[PDB]
């Protein structure tokens, strides 16, 4: 699947060292399927793969 027209908003962020930040990404998916979320910077790490 390919996603477009997507935006991101962070309701809460706390550098607490136990995944204290949570983000919501609104997406328009081309079709049902499985994708892999990855952060493009080293400073933040994502719990889910």
């Amino acid at each position: 699947p390919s996603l477009t027209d997507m935006s991101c908003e962070v309701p809460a962020c706390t550098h607490s060292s136990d995944f204290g930040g949570v983000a919501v990404i609104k997406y328009a998916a081309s079709k049902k399927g499985k994708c892999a979320v990855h952060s493009m910077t080293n400073a933040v790490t994502i719990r889910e793969a």
């Binding site: 309701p11 809460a12 949570v22």
Partner: protein, 49 residues
Amino acid sequence: KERGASLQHTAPFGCQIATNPVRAVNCAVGNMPISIDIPEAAFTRVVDA
């Protein structure tokens, strides 16, 4: 025969004076610091609200 007016009729700040035991009730003077320790169970995260 010559008591005059008691405290409950002359006290400032609208205090109500009572006996047995002697009490002063509802004196609208000054202010009150209140400190509340609230458990984590009472809070709701922003993403759930």
